[PDB]
Amino acid sequence: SKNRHEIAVMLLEGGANPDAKDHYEATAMHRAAAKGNLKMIHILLYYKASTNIQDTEGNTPLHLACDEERVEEAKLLVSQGASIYIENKEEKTPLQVAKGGLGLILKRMVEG
Amino acid sequence: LDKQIQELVEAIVLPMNHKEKFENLGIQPPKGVLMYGPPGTGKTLLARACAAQTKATFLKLAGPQLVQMFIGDGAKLVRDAFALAKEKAPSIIFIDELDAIGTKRFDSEKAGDREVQRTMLELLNQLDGFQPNTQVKVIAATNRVDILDPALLRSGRLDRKIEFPMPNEEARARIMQIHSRKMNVSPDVNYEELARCTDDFNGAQCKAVCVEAGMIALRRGATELTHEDYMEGILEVQ
Amino acid sequence: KGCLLYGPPGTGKTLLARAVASQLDCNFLKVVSSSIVDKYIGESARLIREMFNYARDHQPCIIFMDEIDAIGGRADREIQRTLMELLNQMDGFDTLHRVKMIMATNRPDTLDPALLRPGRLDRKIHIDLPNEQARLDILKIHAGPITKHGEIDYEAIVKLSDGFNGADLRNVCTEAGMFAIRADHDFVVQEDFMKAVRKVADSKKLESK
Amino acid sequence: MDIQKQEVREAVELPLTHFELYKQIGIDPPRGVLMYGPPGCGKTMLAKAVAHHTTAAFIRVVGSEFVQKYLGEGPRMVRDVFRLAKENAPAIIFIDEIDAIATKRFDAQTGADREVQRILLELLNQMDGFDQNVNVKVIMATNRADTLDPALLRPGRLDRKIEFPLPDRRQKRLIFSTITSKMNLSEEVDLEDYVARPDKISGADINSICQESGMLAVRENRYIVLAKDFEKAYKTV
Amino acid sequence: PTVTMMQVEEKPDVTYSDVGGCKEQIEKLREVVETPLLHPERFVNLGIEPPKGVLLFGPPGTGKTLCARAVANRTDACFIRVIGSELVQKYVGEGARMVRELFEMARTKKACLIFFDEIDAIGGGDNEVQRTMLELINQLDGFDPRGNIKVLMATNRPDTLDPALMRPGRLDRKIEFSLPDLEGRTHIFKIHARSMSVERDIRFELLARLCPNSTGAEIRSVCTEAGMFAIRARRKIATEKDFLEAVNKVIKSYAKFS
């Protein structure tokens, strides 16, 4: 979450668990996708990390990336295999969370 | 009951009389006496009859009377009870069913009985913190002492704890002799057969047998109670 | 601001806390272990914050909690929850420089070693036995106003009293007075103290559990 | 945001000098700004930000400052603050919680609230007459607008209705850094779970919540506040 | 209100010679209402004290007929009744003044008898009801007013648990009100001969032996519902052939569900 490249590469190199969840059922991709850490998400995807971790409310990291209008994280995560069908307890889709026509390129990158 | 009703009647009569040495040498009479034991003994009507024999003014009051529909009234009835008792002459007041509020339950979330028993703690404040408590006493009786307040160890608090040692036909014959020691009694009563017929009976059940004697007294036509009416009522209602 | 009074052998803490608390106490606030039945559901946050809020509003306050071993055992999750509220409201985010609380118990074994931490319970004093000093002293102060016969001898009263307490000897002496009170004699002979104190003292030896 | 501080900026503090601008530009900017958000108390952080950015007087008044058995001192107070606003400096009047003086009532037994709301209609006609050549800037916010009367929210009186349900994550980082930068901070004090969870749960007046955490750090036993007082101050208040 | 002056039970009604089959119960509750006043010296001289009263509950059936017997067969002065519907009213707290004014009028009437009706309307926070019933038992346990005073508790539902546990002190005789018989109804009809103008063509035996399950309320609906069903057409003569449909309908159409 602090955008520490070398600390993340060295922690994950020693045998860290990418799918490790806290008591709030949130992984490091919720925070990295919440603060705009594009390259951190990318180097997390270098180690074959999952992108569809449900939070305590059910929001995926795509909901937290698109919530803050992160176009690069939306195009990256959706272009890498993010599942938009997984909904939260509020029954909100990633297209409805983002505004300004961002859901149009979300579904465009899902179908394409 | 002479070994316990003698100390009881003395303990409720001499405080009104022995004031001389109570004020000269400062002897503390028993303020709290616990007349407990097995049920059916008739402690309520025996303490009411003895309270009527003390000649002092008697005021009725029960255990669950502290529980009201509203809140804050228990302090009005206890502070007011010791206001009429504080201002008035030394009298006798007997209550019953104290064990219902003297229970130390292990749950600790919330209840209104916490506030009712807190008013009880105000009564213990007015019996413990008040050194002029040589005035009107508070007599309390319980029908069971399975769960009793451990903080009742004080001369002003419930100290005279007298158990009822298996109240056989002698005890029932004596409480019936005190409950019916004034009205028309036949001058031949051995108490052996009529008391022996009473087995595991209650006080209100023996006095209900007496009420049955008053029921067939209309169809007997005699001028005075007889001897066979006791066993006739016992075998009649029970 | 706290103190632990554990007196497993013999009694006498009630005579002390009730002695000074009956003398001045600067206030009255007694918490007896019997008045916490609590058979309803529960919204006691504003209740414990209500009583403790009264202890915060009133500058002088002294709280007694006698026989705390029954409500402080080490249907128990709610008890431990109320004890967690007691921790969070006794060592909480409020200054308690002026309030003082005293907690009495019976056995120092199940006294919640999380509660045994200082702050909540700082001082601890053990009461082993009522030594002859306080025994003969309490006998002299309890024998002051009540007159006795010219034949005075305290060696028999002290000698026949073995393994007793201050309140027990109090109820035995006052019980002996309530035994000689039947013969309405102005003077009190000490032979009836030997008889009545002997028999009632034997009743306290048999019922000393 | 980016429209709240800009619209309140150019509509509040830019016309706060050289009074001739109100008629040099023609249509004077509307002074009515109605904030919302009932999770927290709020309505304080922005009044402090204006109280520190702009160097002028601020005569704040609780919404029940004149609710009494009498009827006077209303036009005396607001008229004195108006004449000192156009005389010495255009002080911004802070009238919070107008729901106590804007509640519907038809019965005549409570003619005190209806009387002071008729006085509110009198000063409503005063501000109707105060749209031409006057130095007045009155901010009026509340927590609930469902019970507000239509005569208050009528166009021409309150033309700005800014909504604030929850601040974005960047405004969370700023609203936490602006208060933790002065107070004692440490490595355990982190804004990651505190930028993630308080973004899920709806909560206003975050600065006041951090001040409550200061009331949890007022013991002086622990010199640096930690996550225990933060999460405890979250679950409690 | 009007119930204070109307509380007097004038206009006597059903007497003893027309009882509804009561054989043993009529004595069990008669020897406490009629005989103690006729012979007070026997109870005070013979034993402890005269009996107080009995307990009547269960199904309604022929209820209030025995109280009508007590009103009719009164020797000197008819007693005063008390209903439960006068207690539960607006402005709670008037029950103490009401029980004090009926106790005052009761002591003004040299401690006469008191009849309590519908105790379940107030029985079953009820602190004022506890004040009324504890002032009743409390003020009535004292021998100062009189010892021959009689109470009568009538109810339909036994859901009055507090009176059921406070009654063993003073009250007794927890028995059912009355069971109906088959041959006694002709006397209820004989006293219904003082009712509206029933034509002499009707025979009481033919109307009596042609209706089973004919409890006091149901025969009260035979004469009442028969007469009023004869007023449906506003006729003048009431022949049994006119309302035979009312008879077999009032016993059968009502005997369907019960």
SS3 track for chain E: CHHHHCCECCCCCCCHHHCCCCCCHHHHCCCCCCHHHHCHHHHHHHCCCCCCCEEEECCCCCCCHHHHHHHHCCCCCCCEEEECCCCCCCCCCHHHHHHHHHHHHHHHCCCCCEEEECHHHCCCCCHHHHHHHHHHHHHHHCCCCCCCCCCEEECCCCCCHHHHHHHHHHCCCEEECCCCCCCCHHHHHHHHHHCCCCCCCCCHHHHHCCCCCCCHHHHHHHHHHHHHHHHCCCCCCCCCCCCHHHHHHHHHHHHCCC
A81 to A17, A25, A36, B143, D128: CA distances (angstroms): 20, 21, 19, 77, 60
Q: How far apart are CA B49 and CA B51, in angstroms?
A: 5
CB contact under 8 A, C170 and B155: yes
| d(C-alpha E40, C-alpha E28), whole Å | 18
Residues of B in contact with E47 (CB under 8 A): 183-184, 213-214, 217, 224-225
D139 bridge partner residues: D94
Question: Measuring CA to CA, which residue among B139, B124, B133, B98 is closest to residue B13?
Answer: B139
Residue pair B15/B137 in contact by the 8 Å Cβ criterion: yes
Q: How far apart are the first and last CA of chain E?
A: 39
B221: phi then psi, degrees, rounded to nearest 5: 75, 5
d(CA B131, CA B122): 15
> Best interface-test mutation with D: which of C93, C96, C117 has the largest number of D CBs within 10 A?
C93
Please name the residues in contact with B147: beta carbons below 8 A apart, sequence gap of 6 or more. B99, B102, B103, B104
User: Sheet of C123-126: strands edge to edge?
Assistant: C30-32, C62-66, C100-105, C3-6, C123-126
| Residue E185, both tokens | 């109804």
Bridge partners, C123 (sequence order): C3
- Cβ distance of B110 and C146 shorter than 8 Å: no
Query: How far is the C-alpha of C183 from the C-alpha of B175, rounded, in Å?
Result: 26
Handedness of CA B147, B152, B153, B155 (dihedral sign): negative
Q: What is the CA radius of gyration of chain A?
A: 14
Number of Cβ within a 10 Å radius of residue C41: 9
Q: Which helix (H) or strand (E) holds C123?
A: strand C123-126
Q: How many Å separate Cα E102 from the centre of its chain?
A: 19
The 3-class SS string of D150-174 reads CCCCCCCCCCEECCCCCCCHHHHHH
Q: What is the DSSP letter of C182?
A: G
In DSSP notation, A48-68 reads T--S----SS---HHHHHHHT
CA separation (Å) from E37 to B217, E34, E99, E111? 15, 6, 24, 12
Say if the Cβ atoms of E125 and B68 lie within 8 Å: yes
CB-closest option in E35, E126, E172 to B211: E172
Kind of pairing, strands C123-126 and C100-105?
A: unpaired
CA distance D32 to D138: 7
The identity of residue D109, as a single letter, is Q
- The rounded distance, in Å, linking the Cα atoms of B201 and B169 is 9
CA-to-CA distance for C61 and A112, rounded, in angstroms?
A: 75
How many C-beta atoms lie closer than 10 Å to residue D73's C-beta? Answer: 12
**Beta pairing partners, C100:** C62
Say which amino acid occupies B109.
E
Beta pairing, strands B158-161 & C30-32: unpaired
**CA E23 from centroid of its chain's CA atoms:** 17
If residue C201 lies in a helix (H) or strand (E), which one and from where to where?
Answer: helix C191-206
What's CA C128's distance to the chain center, in Å?
Answer: 14
List beta partners, residue D137: D92
Chains E and D touch (3+ CB pairs under 8 A): no
Distance from chain centroid for Cα C164: 16
CB-based contact, D219 to chain C, within 8 Å: yes
- For the record, the structure tokens of B115 come out as 């506030």
Dihedral sign, Cα of residue B25, residue B26, residue B29, residue B30: negative
- Relative orientation angle of helices D227-236 and D193-200, to the nearest 10 degrees: 0
Contact E168 B204 (CB under 8 A): yes
Q: Letter for the amino acid at E119?
A: I
What CA dihedral angle connects A3, A6, A9 and A10, to 10 degrees? -130
Cα of D192 to nearest chain A Cα, Å: 7
Can you say which residues of D are annotated as belonging to the binding site for ATP? 37-44
Q: Write phi, then psi, for C44 (nearest 5 degrees).
A: -70, 10
**N residues, chain C:** 209
Which of C11, C145, C170 lies closest to B26 in CB terms? C145
A65 part of contact set with chain D, CB < 8 Å: no
Q: Answer whether E63's CB lies under 8 Å from E177's CB.
A: yes
DSSP-derived letter for residue C103 is E
d(CA B203, CA B40): 5
Q: What is the DSSP letter of C6?
A: E
**D193 and D214 Cβ atoms separated by less than 8 Å:** no
Chain D residue numbers with beta carbons less than 8 Å from the beta carbon of C93 are 215-216, 218-219
Give dist(CA E247, CA E226) in Å, integer.
Answer: 7
State how far the Cα of E157 lies from the Cα of C9, in Å rounded to an integer: 59
Identify which of E126, E188, E131, E132 has the alpha carbon closest to the alpha carbon of residue E159.
E126
- DSSP run (H or E) holding C69: none
Three-class SS of C29-49: CEEECCCCCCCCCCCCHHHHH
Tally of CB atoms within 10 A around A102: 17
**Is the distance from CB of D192 to CB of D222 less than 8 angstroms?**
no
What are the phi and psi torsion angles at C189 (to 5°)?
-80, 145
What count of residues does chain D have? 237
Residues A42 and A12 sit within 8 Å (Cβ to Cβ): no
Reported as type and span, the H/E element at residue B7 is helix B2-17
Tokens of A66: 């698109």
Q: Residue B97 and residue D125: Cα distance in Å, rounded?
A: 71
Backbone phi, psi, residue C102, to 5°: -130, 130
In chain D the first and final C-alpha atoms are separated, in Å, by 25
Strand-pairing partners, residue C124, are C4
Looking up tokens 């595991």, which residue turns up? B200
HSE, side-chain direction, 13 A CA sphere, residue C190: 14
How far D165 CA lies from chain C's nearest CA (Å)? 29
State how far the alpha carbon of C119 is from the alpha carbons of A69, C65, C113, C133, E74, in Å: 51, 16, 13, 33, 81
Give the neighbor-by-neighbor strand order of the sheet with E114-117. E80-83, E114-117, E152-154, E54-57, E174-176
Of D171, D212, D181, the residue nearest D41 (C-alpha): D212
* Residue indicated by tokens 């009786």: B141
Tokens representing residue E37 in the block:
């006043």
Are the C-beta atoms of C31 and C101 separated by less than 8 Å? no
Look at the block and give the residue holding tokens 């255009």. Answer: D90
Facing C67 at nearest CB: one of B110, B128, B150: B150
B30 neighbourhood in chain C, CB within 8 Å: 178
Question: Sign of the CA dihedral C159, C161, C166, C171?
Answer: negative
Write the CB contacts of A26 (distance below 8 Å, at least 6 apart in sequence). A53, A55, A56, D193, D196
| Residue B129 vs residues B132, B137, D165: alpha-carbon distances, Å | 9, 14, 58
Resolution of this entry in Å? 7.9
Q: How far apart are CA B31 and CA C175, in angstroms?
A: 13
CB atoms within 10 A of CB B163: 12
Chain C residues lying within 8 Å of D216, measured CB to CB: 93
Nearest of B87, B86, B149 to residue B117 by alpha carbon: B149
Residue with tokens 């922005």: D46
Distance (Å, whole) CA C196 – CA C174: 10
D196/A35 CB distance under 8 A: no
Q: Of the candidates E182, E218, E247, which has an alpha carbon nearest to the alpha carbon of residue E62?
A: E218
Q: Tell me which chain B residue has its CA closest to the CA of residue E53.
A: B215
The two structure tokens encoding residue E121: 């309307």
- Pair of tokens at residue B210: 């007496």
Q: C73: which residues sit within 8 A by CB, 6+ positions away?
A: C79, C110
The number of CA neighbours under 13 Å toward the Cβ of B77 is 18
Q: How far apart are CA C46 and CA C123, in angstroms?
A: 29
Q: How far is CA E255 from the centre of its chain?
A: 24
Question: Chain B residues with CB inside 8 Å of C71's CB?
Answer: 106, 108
Residue E125 assigned as binding residue: no
State both tokens at B213: 């004697």
Burial letters C2-12, b for 16+ CB under 10 A, else e: bbbbbbeebeb
Beta strands in chain D (DSSP E): 33-34, 60-62, 92-96, 137-141, 160-161
> Which residue in E has a C-alpha nearest to residue B68's C-alpha?
E127
Rg for chain B (alpha carbons), in Å? 20
B44 is in an annotated binding site: yes
Cβ proximity of D159 and D28 under 8 Å = no
Q: Which phi and psi (to 5°) does residue D206 adopt?
A: -60, -35
Q: Where are the beta strands (DSSP E) in chain A?
A: none
Record the tokens describing residue D39, joined without a space.
């999770």
Instruction: Look at E36 and B218 and tell me if their CB atoms are within 8 Å.
Output: yes
Residues D56 and D137: their CA atoms lie apart, in Å, by 12
Structural tokens at position B116: 């009712």
Binding residue per annotation — E60?
Answer: yes
Known binding-site residues of C for ATP equal 7-14
**Beta bridge pairs of residue B92:** B58, B137
Residue in B32, B25, B36, B207 with CA at minimum distance from that of residue B120: B32
CA–CA distance, E67 with E33 (Å, rounded to integer): 10
**B31 Cα to chain C: minimum distance (Å):** 13
Q: In this structure, which amino acid lies at residue B10?
A: E
Q: For an interface test with E, which of B215, B216, B230, B236 has the most E Cβ atoms less than 10 Å from its Cβ? A: B215
Residue A23 burial (C-beta neighbours within 10 Å; 0-12, 13-18, 19+): exposed
With vertex at residue D23, the alpha carbon angle to CA D20 and CA D24, rounded to the nearest 5 degrees, is 75
Two structure tokens written together for C72: 């402080």
How many Cβ atoms from other residues are within 10 Å of residue A90's Cβ? 12
Contact assessment for residue C158 and residue C194, using Cβ atoms and an 8 Å cutoff: no
Contacts of E46 in chain B (CB under 8 A): 184, 217, 220, 222-225
Q: Distance (Å, rounded) from C-alpha D69 to C-alpha D74?
A: 12
Q: Which tokens is B129 given? A: 């913190």
What residues contact E101, with CB distance under 8 A and at least 6 apart?
A: E4
Q: DSSP per residue over B44-77, as a string?
A: HHHHHHHHHHT-S-B----SGGG--SSSSHHHHH
Structure-block tokens of residue E78: 């008819």
Helix (H, G, I), strand (E, B) or coil at D12: helix
The partner residues of E116 in beta bridges, in order of sequence, read: E82, E153
The answer to whether B59 and B89 are in contact (CB under 8 A) is no
Nearest Cα to Cα of residue C32 among C19, C18, C46: C18
Alpha carbons D69 and D196: distance in angstroms, whole number: 49
Q: Which residue has the tokens 């004040």?
A: E131
